[PDB]
Amino acid sequence: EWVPTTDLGILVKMGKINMEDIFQYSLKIKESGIVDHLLKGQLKEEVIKIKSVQKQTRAGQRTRMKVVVVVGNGAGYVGIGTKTSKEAATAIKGAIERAKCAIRPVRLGFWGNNYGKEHTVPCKATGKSGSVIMRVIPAPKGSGIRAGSVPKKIFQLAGVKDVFTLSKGQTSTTENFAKATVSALDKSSCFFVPEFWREKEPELNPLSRYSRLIKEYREKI
Amino acid sequence: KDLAFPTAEELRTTCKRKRLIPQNNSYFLYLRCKSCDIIILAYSHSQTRRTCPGCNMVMLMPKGGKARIEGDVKIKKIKR
Amino acid sequence: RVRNSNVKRAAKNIVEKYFPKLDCDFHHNKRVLESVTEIQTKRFKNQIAGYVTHLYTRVEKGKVKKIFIKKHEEERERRENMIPSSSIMDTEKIEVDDITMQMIKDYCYRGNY
Amino acid sequence: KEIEIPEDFVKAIILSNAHLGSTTATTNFKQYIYGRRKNDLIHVIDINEMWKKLIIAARLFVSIEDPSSIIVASNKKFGKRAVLRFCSETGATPLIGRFIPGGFTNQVINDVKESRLVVVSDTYADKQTVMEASYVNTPCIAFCNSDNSLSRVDVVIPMNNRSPLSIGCGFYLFAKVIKYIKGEESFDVDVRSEIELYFYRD
Amino acid sequence: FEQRICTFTGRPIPHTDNASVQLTFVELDSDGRATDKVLIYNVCGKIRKDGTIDEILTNTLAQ
Amino acid sequence: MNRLAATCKAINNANRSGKRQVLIRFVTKTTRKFLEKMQVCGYISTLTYIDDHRQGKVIIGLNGRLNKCGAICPNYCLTLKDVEKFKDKILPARQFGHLILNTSKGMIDHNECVTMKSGGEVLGFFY
Amino acid sequence: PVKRKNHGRAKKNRGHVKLIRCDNCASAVPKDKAIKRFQIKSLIEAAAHDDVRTATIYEEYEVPKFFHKNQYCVSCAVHLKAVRCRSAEGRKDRSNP
RNA sequence: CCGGGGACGUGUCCGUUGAUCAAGGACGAAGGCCGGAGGAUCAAAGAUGAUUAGAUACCGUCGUAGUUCCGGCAGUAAACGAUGCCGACGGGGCGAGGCCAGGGGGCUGUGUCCGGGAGAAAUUGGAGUGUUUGGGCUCUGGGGAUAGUACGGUCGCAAGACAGA
Ligand SMILES: [Mg+2]
Ligand SMILES: [Mg+2]
Ligand SMILES: [Mg+2]
Ligand SMILES: [Mg+2]
Ligand SMILES: [Mg+2]
Ligand SMILES: [Mg+2]
Ligand SMILES: [Zn+2]
Ligand SMILES: [Zn+2]
């Protein structure tokens, strides 16, 4: 069992907030056990790259393994995190909880028309990490994920099914090539389209809406 | 702050060409010599000496911008 | 010699928890320390009880900004309650400089340069 | 309508030298300036603009359900009792001295509560808190001087913080409007005895 | 999926922005007391760090 | 410079800066109908020309729903079957966006030239 | 990379600054790049000032100052320690103490 | 003395006369070359005295070309901001420019500091407004080395230069 020290996980353990309305009001997920509680069924961890970094000290090269991992549900949510540690299995479970803290929603869209369920990225966007430019392009249905091996693993966990991609720069740098491809999905999802031109009246955010309700849960313990 | 309606405070600060409508800082005027009954007329940013013809004194001398007026002269702007 | 954090953080806790039972003389200050703690080796008692006296000398002057003692804020709040010579009564026909009065021309009183 | 300043309250801020603003003003501050003293080269702050930013700050303060969630901070020792007399009165959590960085982000430390608002005495003196608040989606009211920076500050209260009485007057008046917003106490406060607790006397 | 439109810019608030702040303001009575209803305000990240969030919120709440 | 491309860049600078009005120091005949076409799709709210007997002045109110406006120089001769390929380059998605052609029916949108059976010269875009 | 924003010298909006000779090395350094230390000290050193009071003809004699502009090239200025070893962020200091 | 120059100021004139450039032309530090004049200092070359394992160098001394001027050639530099020109737009602060205004002002130069944006990063008011990629125009680059070398060409008294595998 996990004890939700964070205030948002208090409302998550109480089931006050769904997954989709965390990112509605832009509340930072401090603790990783929030989203594994919400996505207890579907959450797949997939290791992108294990590589070993070194610093030369006085005696010998201090070598440590640096892993970069991607987590995601079946469709809609994806995150990436990286941790470097002395032994790789310590680094992976540290990277996974960092990825779970950094899950972002990916809005999917329709390529041409609104029939069926959504399958592709909604707009054309570009994620740019250091010197790696990944550009996602909406693809018609059945086209599949047209990408390299590392973005396709992110694209599978993000739940897109048809995408055309373009890359520039040093895509062998796979931490940058993974950080760019989620940044495109980050940017294509919050592209401001005429479907969302409709102004909604703003709503009170749930952590200050349930601001009375959280303090008794600490007073219970 | 509205760009289509610039306040009268900001218009005199900004450049004459950079206003919403290009507005002159110059004008014309009348110079009144005391020994002399006529009123010689001249430009504000004048580039020529102006002297009252009879009872000959020098009214304004040209300068870098506005012409500086010499001696005892009453000036009146001319706008209408 | 220089004490370490195993001694200093210890001796900080002794003077903080048990201040009134202490005194400036070291041998009495050690005699409380066997009575009130459990420290195994007799040299390391003298390491701690020595620095307790080096603390209790400067906490008698009240110099340390960290530790906090129940007697030392109730004496402080007597010092805090100054018999107030607030200048709101001491200033009569307030001299405000030439441009400072002009900003208060809507609702004004006590006009002086 | 607009709430009018008491002659009692405006009596305080002139001898607080809160309108004695600073020698320099930024273009973000010029709307808070009626004029500047041509003698001392000191910008004199608008009191009417100062008072209405106080009531917006009071409006923003009470809007949270619990005032104890609000973590008010002051780096300097001038406002040590100005925040101590504040939090006994308003029922908020005080932060005095050096704000330990990571105080809102690092979850290994649980000294205070997760903030839903912070208000600081000075963005120059508490640049660490106003940055750390922006990492956790937390609003920031600030008392801000004429020379001071105002980035990552939601509500600027244009007032001086370089006098010992000045933040003592400002934290007093911000406590005065708060219970006036709740209707807990009107302006019938008799400042003869109250504001001196906020004052820094030593 | 829905994203918060910032009130002052009119732009959507960017994806997972920490500087983005929820702003709550109670409506004010005629005598100056608090009321139960609340103005709810959405603020983009970059307009805070520019420092331009102050002067816009002055004129919006002056209305 | 090019007065259309200078107009589109100066709009984008004010748009990215969250400004609500942009004063542009010049109007032409082609950027008048470009901003009026930008208005009817709701991308810009308040449009006011100013006749100062020189180049011109237009003050564009920024609606907040303009991602980017641009100008395509040189104005490529495009047939009917090419503008469907050209809109795929320029616009982000098929569901929205406006590619503007200077065809014989008028300065019109890429959706309309499909309807009006027109080609013409590509001027710019917005979305 | 570019180590200094001014490239070591104070030359801006010039093409050419005339060279001067180093006071220690006789190197040809431009007047802008050259380290210049204007020293104004007394002619008689301060140890001997009591001995000149006993020896002056004049009541209230003021010992004259010595005026010299030491102009050093870069190589000898660090060797004569006219310029102090500073950090990379310490390089951007410009004020004298 | 003759000549030039930009900025500012202006109800002065003309009215699109413009921007950028193959070709072409002019200028172009130092060193160099030619003819003439001159020659104090310094000083390639050269000569020495030392240093050194050696020392054709660094150090000392001397010394010619040269450094200087006039007429010409040459046409190169880390000729650098290692950043083409023109144009639109874009944050604050501080400075010691010039002109104007007299209302912490405007134009135009010029540095600087902090941010924004950009960038592989150093950094950067352009190296920003770039995959949401299109302002015009000119030039250049396409892994290293061969090599800025050879051949052919043009220019030069020559040195060599341009160009260029
Ligand atoms: Mg040069
Ligand atoms: Mg020469
Ligand atoms: Mg020569
Ligand atoms: Mg000769
Ligand atoms: Mg010699
Ligand atoms: Mg040849
Ligand atoms: Zn006369
Ligand atoms: Zn030297």
Side-chain angles (χ1 to χ4, degrees), chain A residues 49-75:
Chain A
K49 186 71 176 293
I50 310 102
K51 81 169 199 178
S52 69
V53 304
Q54 291 170 333
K55 63 169 279 183
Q56 198 100 357
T57 184
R58 184 185 298 113
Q61 322 162 341
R62 183 216 72 180
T63 176
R64 285 174 38 177
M65 319 299 304
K66 171 188 186 178
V67 304
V68 47
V69 77
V70 58
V71 303
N73 72 325

PDB file of all heavy atoms in Angstrom, chain A residues 49-75:
ATOM      1  N   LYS A  49      17.024   3.001 -24.141  1.00  0.00           N
ATOM      2  CA  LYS A  49      18.454   2.840 -24.339  1.00  0.00           C
ATOM      3  C   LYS A  49      19.149   2.713 -23.000  1.00  0.00           C
ATOM      4  O   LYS A  49      18.911   3.513 -22.095  1.00  0.00           O
ATOM      5  CB  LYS A  49      19.046   4.019 -25.104  1.00  0.00           C
ATOM      6  CG  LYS A  49      20.499   3.826 -25.464  1.00  0.00           C
ATOM      7  CD  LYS A  49      20.642   2.771 -26.544  1.00  0.00           C
ATOM      8  CE  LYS A  49      22.086   2.624 -26.990  1.00  0.00           C
ATOM      9  NZ  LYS A  49      22.567   3.838 -27.698  1.00  0.00           N
ATOM     10  N   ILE A  50      20.005   1.709 -22.890  1.00  0.00           N
ATOM     11  CA  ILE A  50      20.926   1.560 -21.779  1.00  0.00           C
ATOM     12  C   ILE A  50      22.298   1.909 -22.316  1.00  0.00           C
ATOM     13  O   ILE A  50      22.803   1.233 -23.218  1.00  0.00           O
ATOM     14  CB  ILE A  50      20.920   0.134 -21.209  1.00  0.00           C
ATOM     15  CG1 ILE A  50      19.501  -0.354 -20.922  1.00  0.00           C
ATOM     16  CG2 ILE A  50      21.783   0.056 -19.974  1.00  0.00           C
ATOM     17  CD1 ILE A  50      18.961  -1.313 -21.971  1.00  0.00           C
ATOM     18  N   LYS A  51      22.896   2.973 -21.798  1.00  0.00           N
ATOM     19  CA  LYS A  51      24.259   3.290 -22.174  1.00  0.00           C
ATOM     20  C   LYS A  51      25.018   3.729 -20.935  1.00  0.00           C
ATOM     21  O   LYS A  51      24.432   4.173 -19.947  1.00  0.00           O
ATOM     22  CB  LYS A  51      24.313   4.353 -23.278  1.00  0.00           C
ATOM     23  CG  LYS A  51      24.150   5.780 -22.827  1.00  0.00           C
ATOM     24  CD  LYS A  51      24.494   6.717 -23.963  1.00  0.00           C
ATOM     25  CE  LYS A  51      24.802   8.108 -23.464  1.00  0.00           C
ATOM     26  NZ  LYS A  51      25.189   9.006 -24.581  1.00  0.00           N
ATOM     27  N   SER A  52      26.334   3.582 -20.993  1.00  0.00           N
ATOM     28  CA  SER A  52      27.191   3.807 -19.843  1.00  0.00           C
ATOM     29  C   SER A  52      27.997   5.076 -20.039  1.00  0.00           C
ATOM     30  O   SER A  52      28.712   5.223 -21.033  1.00  0.00           O
ATOM     31  CB  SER A  52      28.135   2.635 -19.625  1.00  0.00           C
ATOM     32  OG  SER A  52      29.102   2.577 -20.654  1.00  0.00           O
ATOM     33  N   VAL A  53      27.891   5.981 -19.079  1.00  0.00           N
ATOM     34  CA  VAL A  53      28.633   7.229 -19.101  1.00  0.00           C
ATOM     35  C   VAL A  53      29.784   7.111 -18.121  1.00  0.00           C
ATOM     36  O   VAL A  53      29.752   6.309 -17.183  1.00  0.00           O
ATOM     37  CB  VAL A  53      27.733   8.434 -18.773  1.00  0.00           C
ATOM     38  CG1 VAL A  53      26.577   8.469 -19.732  1.00  0.00           C
ATOM     39  CG2 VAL A  53      27.224   8.355 -17.357  1.00  0.00           C
ATOM     40  N   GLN A  54      30.830   7.886 -18.370  1.00  0.00           N
ATOM     41  CA  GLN A  54      32.058   7.803 -17.600  1.00  0.00           C
ATOM     42  C   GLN A  54      32.543   9.194 -17.244  1.00  0.00           C
ATOM     43  O   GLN A  54      32.434  10.118 -18.048  1.00  0.00           O
ATOM     44  CB  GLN A  54      33.149   7.083 -18.380  1.00  0.00           C
ATOM     45  CG  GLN A  54      32.888   5.615 -18.589  1.00  0.00           C
ATOM     46  CD  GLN A  54      33.850   4.995 -19.556  1.00  0.00           C
ATOM     47  OE1 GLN A  54      34.387   5.667 -20.428  1.00  0.00           O
ATOM     48  NE2 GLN A  54      34.082   3.701 -19.408  1.00  0.00           N
ATOM     49  N   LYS A  55      33.067   9.348 -16.036  1.00  0.00           N
ATOM     50  CA  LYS A  55      33.906  10.488 -15.717  1.00  0.00           C
ATOM     51  C   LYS A  55      35.270   9.986 -15.271  1.00  0.00           C
ATOM     52  O   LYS A  55      35.378   9.016 -14.519  1.00  0.00           O
ATOM     53  CB  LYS A  55      33.274  11.403 -14.657  1.00  0.00           C
ATOM     54  CG  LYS A  55      33.050  10.813 -13.290  1.00  0.00           C
ATOM     55  CD  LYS A  55      32.673  11.879 -12.280  1.00  0.00           C
ATOM     56  CE  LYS A  55      33.884  12.607 -11.756  1.00  0.00           C
ATOM     57  NZ  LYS A  55      33.512  13.594 -10.713  1.00  0.00           N
ATOM     58  N   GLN A  56      36.312  10.609 -15.797  1.00  0.00           N
ATOM     59  CA  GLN A  56      37.667  10.266 -15.402  1.00  0.00           C
ATOM     60  C   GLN A  56      37.951  10.946 -14.076  1.00  0.00           C
ATOM     61  O   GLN A  56      37.919  12.176 -13.991  1.00  0.00           O
ATOM     62  CB  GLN A  56      38.663  10.716 -16.462  1.00  0.00           C
ATOM     63  CG  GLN A  56      40.004  10.041 -16.355  1.00  0.00           C
ATOM     64  CD  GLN A  56      40.157   8.905 -17.333  1.00  0.00           C
ATOM     65  OE1 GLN A  56      39.230   8.580 -18.064  1.00  0.00           O
ATOM     66  NE2 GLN A  56      41.332   8.294 -17.356  1.00  0.00           N
ATOM     67  N   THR A  57      38.171  10.167 -13.027  1.00  0.00           N
ATOM     68  CA  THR A  57      38.699  10.748 -11.806  1.00  0.00           C
ATOM     69  C   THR A  57      40.172  10.369 -11.673  1.00  0.00           C
ATOM     70  O   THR A  57      40.803   9.916 -12.631  1.00  0.00           O
ATOM     71  CB  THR A  57      37.858  10.356 -10.591  1.00  0.00           C
ATOM     72  OG1 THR A  57      38.366  11.032  -9.434  1.00  0.00           O
ATOM     73  CG2 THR A  57      37.878   8.866 -10.343  1.00  0.00           C
ATOM     74  N   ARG A  58      40.721  10.577 -10.469  1.00  0.00           N
ATOM     75  CA  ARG A  58      42.150  10.461 -10.197  1.00  0.00           C
ATOM     76  C   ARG A  58      42.697   9.070 -10.486  1.00  0.00           C
ATOM     77  O   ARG A  58      43.819   8.941 -10.983  1.00  0.00           O
ATOM     78  CB  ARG A  58      42.399  10.814  -8.731  1.00  0.00           C
ATOM     79  CG  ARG A  58      43.846  10.841  -8.290  1.00  0.00           C
ATOM     80  CD  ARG A  58      43.941  11.082  -6.785  1.00  0.00           C
ATOM     81  NE  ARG A  58      43.391  12.374  -6.381  1.00  0.00           N
ATOM     82  CZ  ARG A  58      42.297  12.527  -5.638  1.00  0.00           C
ATOM     83  NH1 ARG A  58      41.626  11.465  -5.219  1.00  0.00           N
ATOM     84  NH2 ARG A  58      41.872  13.742  -5.318  1.00  0.00           N
ATOM     85  N   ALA A  59      41.922   8.025 -10.208  1.00  0.00           N
ATOM     86  CA  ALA A  59      42.411   6.660 -10.354  1.00  0.00           C
ATOM     87  C   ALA A  59      41.937   6.012 -11.649  1.00  0.00           C
ATOM     88  O   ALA A  59      42.755   5.616 -12.483  1.00  0.00           O
ATOM     89  CB  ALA A  59      41.973   5.823  -9.149  1.00  0.00           C
ATOM     90  N   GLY A  60      40.627   5.908 -11.840  1.00  0.00           N
ATOM     91  CA  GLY A  60      40.097   5.253 -13.016  1.00  0.00           C
ATOM     92  C   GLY A  60      38.772   5.864 -13.403  1.00  0.00           C
ATOM     93  O   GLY A  60      38.226   6.707 -12.694  1.00  0.00           O
ATOM     94  N   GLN A  61      38.245   5.417 -14.536  1.00  0.00           N
ATOM     95  CA  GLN A  61      37.008   5.967 -15.074  1.00  0.00           C
ATOM     96  C   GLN A  61      35.835   5.474 -14.242  1.00  0.00           C
ATOM     97  O   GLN A  61      35.556   4.273 -14.201  1.00  0.00           O
ATOM     98  CB  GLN A  61      36.850   5.559 -16.530  1.00  0.00           C
ATOM     99  CG  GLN A  61      38.149   5.550 -17.273  1.00  0.00           C
ATOM    100  CD  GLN A  61      38.068   4.753 -18.545  1.00  0.00           C
ATOM    101  OE1 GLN A  61      37.167   3.932 -18.717  1.00  0.00           O
ATOM    102  NE2 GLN A  61      39.010   4.982 -19.449  1.00  0.00           N
ATOM    103  N   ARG A  62      35.157   6.393 -13.564  1.00  0.00           N
ATOM    104  CA  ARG A  62      33.929   6.053 -12.859  1.00  0.00           C
ATOM    105  C   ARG A  62      32.822   5.855 -13.877  1.00  0.00           C
ATOM    106  O   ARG A  62      32.298   6.826 -14.427  1.00  0.00           O
ATOM    107  CB  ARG A  62      33.556   7.153 -11.875  1.00  0.00           C
ATOM    108  CG  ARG A  62      32.330   6.835 -11.062  1.00  0.00           C
ATOM    109  CD  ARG A  62      31.509   8.071 -10.796  1.00  0.00           C
ATOM    110  NE  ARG A  62      30.825   8.526 -12.000  1.00  0.00           N
ATOM    111  CZ  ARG A  62      30.030   9.587 -12.046  1.00  0.00           C
ATOM    112  NH1 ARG A  62      29.824  10.309 -10.957  1.00  0.00           N
ATOM    113  NH2 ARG A  62      29.449   9.931 -13.185  1.00  0.00           N
ATOM    114  N   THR A  63      32.441   4.606 -14.114  1.00  0.00           N
ATOM    115  CA  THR A  63      31.462   4.278 -15.138  1.00  0.00           C
ATOM    116  C   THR A  63      30.122   3.983 -14.482  1.00  0.00           C
ATOM    117  O   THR A  63      30.060   3.304 -13.453  1.00  0.00           O
ATOM    118  CB  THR A  63      31.941   3.115 -16.013  1.00  0.00           C
ATOM    119  OG1 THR A  63      30.913   2.758 -16.943  1.00  0.00           O
ATOM    120  CG2 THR A  63      32.380   1.909 -15.193  1.00  0.00           C
ATOM    121  N   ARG A  64      29.064   4.563 -15.034  1.00  0.00           N
ATOM    122  CA  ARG A  64      27.721   4.431 -14.499  1.00  0.00           C
ATOM    123  C   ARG A  64      26.759   4.262 -15.660  1.00  0.00           C
ATOM    124  O   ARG A  64      26.944   4.877 -16.712  1.00  0.00           O
ATOM    125  CB  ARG A  64      27.333   5.651 -13.664  1.00  0.00           C
ATOM    126  CG  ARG A  64      27.992   5.705 -12.309  1.00  0.00           C
ATOM    127  CD  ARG A  64      27.689   7.003 -11.597  1.00  0.00           C
ATOM    128  NE  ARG A  64      26.321   7.441 -11.836  1.00  0.00           N
ATOM    129  CZ  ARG A  64      25.773   8.518 -11.285  1.00  0.00           C
ATOM    130  NH1 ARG A  64      26.476   9.274 -10.452  1.00  0.00           N
ATOM    131  NH2 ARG A  64      24.518   8.834 -11.561  1.00  0.00           N
ATOM    132  N   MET A  65      25.743   3.426 -15.476  1.00  0.00           N
ATOM    133  CA  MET A  65      24.783   3.166 -16.538  1.00  0.00           C
ATOM    134  C   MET A  65      23.690   4.217 -16.520  1.00  0.00           C
ATOM    135  O   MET A  65      23.146   4.543 -15.465  1.00  0.00           O
ATOM    136  CB  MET A  65      24.160   1.779 -16.389  1.00  0.00           C
ATOM    137  CG  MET A  65      25.133   0.695 -15.990  1.00  0.00           C
ATOM    138  SD  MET A  65      26.443   0.463 -17.201  1.00  0.00           S
ATOM    139  CE  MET A  65      25.492   0.143 -18.680  1.00  0.00           C
ATOM    140  N   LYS A  66      23.355   4.728 -17.699  1.00  0.00           N
ATOM    141  CA  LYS A  66      22.327   5.750 -17.853  1.00  0.00           C
ATOM    142  C   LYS A  66      21.239   5.191 -18.752  1.00  0.00           C
ATOM    143  O   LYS A  66      21.480   4.927 -19.933  1.00  0.00           O
ATOM    144  CB  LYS A  66      22.893   7.029 -18.453  1.00  0.00           C
ATOM    145  CG  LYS A  66      21.822   8.019 -18.816  1.00  0.00           C
ATOM    146  CD  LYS A  66      22.386   9.187 -19.571  1.00  0.00           C
ATOM    147  CE  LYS A  66      21.322  10.235 -19.802  1.00  0.00           C
ATOM    148  NZ  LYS A  66      21.882  11.419 -20.498  1.00  0.00           N
ATOM    149  N   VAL A  67      20.060   5.012 -18.206  1.00  0.00           N
ATOM    150  CA  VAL A  67      18.954   4.451 -18.960  1.00  0.00           C
ATOM    151  C   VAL A  67      17.930   5.540 -19.227  1.00  0.00           C
ATOM    152  O   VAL A  67      17.797   6.506 -18.469  1.00  0.00           O
ATOM    153  CB  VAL A  67      18.334   3.242 -18.232  1.00  0.00           C
ATOM    154  CG1 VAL A  67      19.398   2.213 -17.965  1.00  0.00           C
ATOM    155  CG2 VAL A  67      17.716   3.663 -16.927  1.00  0.00           C
ATOM    156  N   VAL A  68      17.241   5.408 -20.353  1.00  0.00           N
ATOM    157  CA  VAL A  68      16.133   6.276 -20.720  1.00  0.00           C
ATOM    158  C   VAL A  68      14.940   5.383 -21.026  1.00  0.00           C
ATOM    159  O   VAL A  68      15.054   4.418 -21.791  1.00  0.00           O
ATOM    160  CB  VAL A  68      16.497   7.210 -21.888  1.00  0.00           C
ATOM    161  CG1 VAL A  68      17.181   6.465 -23.010  1.00  0.00           C
ATOM    162  CG2 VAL A  68      15.255   7.890 -22.419  1.00  0.00           C
ATOM    163  N   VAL A  69      13.822   5.644 -20.361  1.00  0.00           N
ATOM    164  CA  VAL A  69      12.683   4.747 -20.422  1.00  0.00           C
ATOM    165  C   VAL A  69      11.476   5.558 -20.874  1.00  0.00           C
ATOM    166  O   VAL A  69      11.454   6.787 -20.778  1.00  0.00           O
ATOM    167  CB  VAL A  69      12.439   4.056 -19.061  1.00  0.00           C
ATOM    168  CG1 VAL A  69      11.765   4.989 -18.087  1.00  0.00           C
ATOM    169  CG2 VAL A  69      11.700   2.734 -19.199  1.00  0.00           C
ATOM    170  N   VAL A  70      10.479   4.857 -21.408  1.00  0.00           N
ATOM    171  CA  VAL A  70       9.212   5.453 -21.810  1.00  0.00           C
ATOM    172  C   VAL A  70       8.077   4.637 -21.200  1.00  0.00           C
ATOM    173  O   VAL A  70       8.108   3.402 -21.211  1.00  0.00           O
ATOM    174  CB  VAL A  70       9.096   5.573 -23.347  1.00  0.00           C
ATOM    175  CG1 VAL A  70       9.228   4.244 -24.057  1.00  0.00           C
ATOM    176  CG2 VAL A  70       7.788   6.214 -23.733  1.00  0.00           C
ATOM    177  N   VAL A  71       7.134   5.325 -20.570  1.00  0.00           N
ATOM    178  CA  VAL A  71       5.931   4.691 -20.053  1.00  0.00           C
ATOM    179  C   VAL A  71       4.743   5.238 -20.818  1.00  0.00           C
ATOM    180  O   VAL A  71       4.791   6.332 -21.384  1.00  0.00           O
ATOM    181  CB  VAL A  71       5.748   4.894 -18.537  1.00  0.00           C
ATOM    182  CG1 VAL A  71       6.949   4.366 -17.798  1.00  0.00           C
ATOM    183  CG2 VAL A  71       5.519   6.346 -18.211  1.00  0.00           C
ATOM    184  N   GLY A  72       3.678   4.455 -20.855  1.00  0.00           N
ATOM    185  CA  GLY A  72       2.484   4.895 -21.536  1.00  0.00           C
ATOM    186  C   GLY A  72       1.324   3.958 -21.317  1.00  0.00           C
ATOM    187  O   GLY A  72       1.522   2.783 -20.998  1.00  0.00           O
ATOM    188  N   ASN A  73       0.110   4.457 -21.490  1.00  0.00           N
ATOM    189  CA  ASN A  73      -1.070   3.613 -21.424  1.00  0.00           C
ATOM    190  C   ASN A  73      -1.313   3.024 -22.813  1.00  0.00           C
ATOM    191  O   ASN A  73      -0.429   3.051 -23.671  1.00  0.00           O
ATOM    192  CB  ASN A  73      -2.261   4.411 -20.886  1.00  0.00           C
ATOM    193  CG  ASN A  73      -2.785   5.422 -21.874  1.00  0.00           C
ATOM    194  OD1 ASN A  73      -2.032   6.012 -22.640  1.00  0.00           O
ATOM    195  ND2 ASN A  73      -4.090   5.635 -21.857  1.00  0.00           N
ATOM    196  N   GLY A  74      -2.494   2.458 -23.042  1.00  0.00           N
ATOM    197  CA  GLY A  74      -2.813   1.988 -24.377  1.00  0.00           C
ATOM    198  C   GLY A  74      -2.941   3.126 -25.367  1.00  0.00           C
ATOM    199  O   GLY A  74      -2.401   3.063 -26.472  1.00  0.00           O
ATOM    200  N   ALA A  75      -3.622   4.195 -24.969  1.00  0.00           N
ATOM    201  CA  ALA A  75      -3.823   5.339 -25.841  1.00  0.00           C
ATOM    202  C   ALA A  75      -4.101   6.562 -24.991  1.00  0.00           C
ATOM    203  O   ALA A  75      -4.933   6.511 -24.083  1.00  0.00           O
ATOM    204  CB  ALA A  75      -4.982   5.103 -26.811  1.00  0.00           C
TER     205      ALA A  75
END
